[PDB]
């Protein structure tokens, strides 16, 4: 009755003296009697009481006590949220994320924590682990960090290879874009653009000949391009690749 009307604490001492103390501990962590509730948190291990106590700690402003309370309560999403609030310990946050088998939702939360970095590469790997690979696609290509994200996603889908290719080509690099082209499982495109590639890359193109024997325009057009290429070069390499062709 007395806790229902206005008086909370007095009901809590009455609860303690009446032999039932769970709601007494709940009211202590509800009221400003954390010093008395500390032994109560000590002997009993109620996880809900621990979560409410950590909420009280983050309300009062104590960051390390609430961090430890959330750590011992197995609620480690609140741990990274508190790290966002004051700690900003992203290294330990990443360690906790790796150790505790993060899910897609926690992957979105750690994407949010990485949003306040300005680099977004860690965002790229985190969303790669997430599996949320549609808006991450456009964020990665939009922030010109397409290289690593494409390096990871080159084994999952190929319906959007062309825009990956064009957007990576405008960056000014062609050494790794060409390897992406070869691995993209597009024989005609890969060969027609290794036509424009240099002499050193031809060996890799020759390796593609070992991988894609169905086509025949690749070797013929490679031969045609090298026939008139600059002045005569070492015939040994040319005859080696001819013998490899058959």
């Amino acid at each position: 009755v007395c806790e229902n009307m206005k008086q909370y604490l007095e009901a809590a001492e009455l609860y303690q003296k009446s032999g039932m103390l769970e709601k007494a501990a709940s009211l202590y962590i509800e009221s400003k009697d954390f010093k008395k509730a500390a032994p109560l948190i000590s002997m009993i291990k109620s996880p809900n009481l621990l979560k409410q106590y950590a909420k009280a700690k983050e309300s009062e402003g104590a960051y390390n006590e609430a961090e430890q309370t959330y750590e011992q309560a197995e609620s480690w999403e609140d741990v990274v949220r508190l790290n966002l609030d004051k700690l900003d310990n992203l290294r330990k946050a990443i360690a906790v994320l790796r150790t505790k088998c993060d899910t897609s939702t926690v992957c979105l939360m750690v994407a949010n924590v990485c949003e306040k970095q300005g680099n977004y590469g860690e965002l790229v790997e985190f969303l790669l682990k997430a599996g949320k690979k549609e808006e991450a696609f456009q964020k990665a290509q939009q922030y010109n960090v397409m290289d690593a994200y494409s390096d990871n996603m080159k084994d999952f889908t190929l319906e959007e290879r062309l825009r990956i290719a064009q957007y990576y080509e405008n960056q000014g690099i062609w050494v790794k874009a060409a390897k992406h082209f070869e691995q993209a499982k597009n024989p005609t495109k890969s060969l027609k653009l290794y036509l424009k590639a240099g002499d050193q890359y031809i060996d890799d193109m020759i390796d593609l000949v070992c991988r894609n024997k169905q086509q025949e325009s690749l070797q013929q057009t490679l031969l045609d391009y090298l026939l008139e290429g600059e002045k005569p070069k070492d015939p040994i390499y040319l005859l080696k690749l001819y013998d490899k062709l058959g």
């Binding site: 197995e74 609620s75 480690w76 999403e77 899910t103 897609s104 939702t105 599996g131 949320k132 690979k133 549609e134 808006e135 499982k185 169905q214």
Partner: protein, 640 residues
């Protein structure tokens, strides 16, 4: 519980049909007919599509994408074709194979495909391109993708097992790594895969089930060779996987044999239930021949979404069975299975095809074809309005008047799929179109007028105020009475696919296939997403797979009944969850295992009050009673 709607169809062809296929698209299914010369395509309405895909090259096999409208065709020359109907695009491979393609199979994700010919050549295709080729002795009947319980680094979906009349089974994948297991032998009829035990189930003509056990680096012979006492034709024997581990076998005989692997229990379903149905149906002026209840069954097909098993007798009777067992676990005995009223057919049924679109059935007998659909009894409640879908066309409307309860019977043009109401209007959506009705209430009589009809395609339509929200598997949009689109909102691909929605007052909620819950407010003229998307995930781990959802009056409390899928183990989970939007947590309620929650219901006006329906598990109570009563209890006298 359910009603069956049968629609006869007009073949209108001189050439005898050979093959029938049903699309597996969740909305607006289509069916395909393969004849020696022509290739016909029909919509759900049963009319001939204007486009015709008949080609000079003879068609010998056709397959449907499990979750997409893309069709795959295989000719007699080994060439394959992939066709998208919605955009009408075709992509064919000339050098698909050098021999005629026998069977085509698709992995559940649809990423990979396997094409086998009579000469024994099996090619694995990533999409439409050749990846790996294998040469095997003698023809291979079928090939199905296998996923053994292997480490994550060694886990890949390209693994598959092929079985044929050669009696040789080998593991293969797109990486050209062929693991030759071989062994067994004989004329293998069918092959199946078991995930938890990594078991290969082989059915041959020798009436000997072979449950082969295989490991990544260890080969083990069949632990048990199950003998069948089957009086029917061994060649015509077919077995299907029912539930988690049930095996249902029929061999053109009156008896249906069900085997349970967990305790290796065999039971039989008979046709004397058909005798009881004839007794309960031949009680009026009905022209039905003498009861021949020893008839054999030609084809058996099971649908998981409807939980309906359809069996076809050779005298022209289609019998239906319902899996009343709760959860994905297989039934343990005959009591769980339920028997549903049958369908009378003129001639003996030949083929049955099942499509995962509300359990659509295509039935073929002789040269005649027909469609079968399952309609769930839908009941809608609003103030002064009770709506019941007793039959396909008959609609029962109940109006509460203090003087007396008024009952109205409404007749529609054809079958009606779904109904809704918002205290003023009655919105009905069927396969063809969507209609809105205004009901006028008067003590002498109630008259209903159709305000409008729009020919738009959608899964669920919810009417509020003056606008209707249409939801499709990927999106949700708003429509008005005139038919303008104020707004449309999309979803991401990996959050899941919209399965079912719930609406109450001014709050609507939907859950996707990947245990993702979205809450929307419709009090505003335009619907607005409240909060953020929430996976059904706890900090410790995933709770399970969502089964049913309910929302209370204000929208603060959401009741969830879910199954945890305990890997061929405990019967789902008899503990339910309550979710609070403010705290964004999922409190868990535990209740005694005597009952299993089935579907929650939330009170319309009271926030704190709700109710739950529970199915009583009769098997476990009997088992516990048998265990307990066999202890110092013998010859108790009197009062028993």
């Amino acid at each position: 519980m359910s009603l069956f709607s049968e629609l006869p169809l007009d073949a209108g062809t001189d050439e005898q049909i050979t093959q029938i296929a049903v699309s597996n698209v969740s909305i607006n299914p289509s069916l395909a007919i393969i004849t020696p010369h022509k290739i016909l395509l029909f919509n759900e309405c049963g009319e001939k599509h204007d486009y015709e895909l008949s080609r000079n090259i003879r068609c010998t096999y056709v397959q449907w994408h499990p979750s997409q409208p893309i069709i795959a065709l295989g000719w007699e020359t080994g060439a394959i074709t992939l066709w998208s109907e919605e955009t009408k695009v075709a992509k064919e491979e000339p050098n698909g194979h050098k021999s005629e393609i026998c069977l085509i199979q698709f992995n559940p994700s649809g990423s990979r495909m396997v094409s086998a010919d009579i000469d024994g050549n099996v090619t694995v295709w990533r999409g439409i391109n050749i990846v790996s080729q294998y040469k095997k002795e003698q023809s291979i009947t079928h090939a199905i993708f296998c996923e053994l319980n292997i480490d994550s680094k060694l886990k890949s979906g390209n693994l598959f097992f092929f079985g044929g009349k050669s009696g040789v089974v080998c593991l293969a994948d797109d990486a050209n790594h062929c693991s030759d297991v071989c062994k067994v032998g004989g004329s293998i009829k069918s092959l199946l895969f078991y995930e938890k035990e990594n078991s290969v189930i082989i059915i041959t003509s020798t009436l000997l089930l072979v449950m082969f056990k295989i490991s990544t680096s260890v080969k083990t012979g069949p632990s048990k060779r199950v003998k069948l006492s089957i009086s029917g034709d061994p060649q015509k024997l077919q077995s299907i996987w029912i539930g988690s581990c049930l095996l249902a076998t029929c061999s053109h005989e009156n008896m249906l044999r069900m085997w349970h692997l967990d305790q290796d229990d065999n039971y039989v379903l008979t046709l004397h239930q058909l005798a009881q149905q004839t007794q309960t149906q031949q009680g009026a002026a009905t022209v039905i021949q003498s009861t021949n209840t020893n008839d054999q069954i030609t084809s058996i097909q099971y649908e998981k979404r409807g939980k309906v098993l359809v069996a076809g007798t050779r005298e022209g009777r289609i019998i239906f069975w319902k899996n009343l067992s709760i959860g994905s676990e297989s039934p343990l005995d005959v009591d769980e299975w339920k028997m549903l009223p049958y369908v009378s057919v003129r001639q003996g049924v030949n083929s049955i095809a099942v499509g995962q679109n509300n359990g659509l059935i295509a039935v073929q007998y002789g040269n005649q074809i027909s469609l079968v659909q399952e309609t769930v009894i839908n009941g809608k409640m609003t103030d002064q309005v009770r709506l019941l879908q007793s039959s396909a066309n008959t609609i029962k409307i109940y109006i509460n008047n203090d003087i007396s309860n008024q009952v109205l019977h409404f007749q529609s043009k054809g079958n009606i799929k779904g109904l809704d109401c918002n205290d003023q209007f009655m919105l009905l959506w069927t396969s063809k179109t969507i209609e809105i009705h205004e009901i006028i209430i008067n003590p002498k009589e109630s008259q209903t007028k159709l305000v409008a009809s729009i020919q738009e395609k959608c899964l669920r339509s919810v009417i509020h105020k003056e606008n209707i929200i249409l939801v499709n598997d990927m999106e949700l949009n708003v429509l008005n009475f005139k038919g303008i689109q104020k707004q449309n909102l999309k979803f991401s691909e990996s959050e899941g696919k919209i399965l079912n929605v719930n609406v109450l007052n001014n709050h609507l909620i939907m859950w996707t296939s990947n245990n993702y819950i979205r809450l929307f407010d419709i009090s505003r003229r335009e619907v607005k997403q409240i909060g953020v998307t929430r996976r059904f995930e706890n900090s410790q781990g995933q709770l399970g797979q969502i089964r049913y959802c309910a929302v209370n009056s204000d929208g603060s409390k959401i009741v969830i009944t879910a199954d945890q899928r305990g890997k061929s183990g405990p019967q789902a989970d008899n503990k339910f969850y309550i979710y609070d939007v403010q705290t964004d947590n999922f409190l868990l309620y535990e209740m005694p295992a005597k009952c299993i929650p089935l579907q929650p219901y939330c009170d319309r006006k009271d926030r704190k009050f709700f109710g739950i329906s529970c199915i009583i598990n009769k098997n476990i109570q009997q088992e516990k009673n048998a265990d307990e009563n066999n202890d110092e209890n013998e010859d108790n006298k009197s009062d028993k």
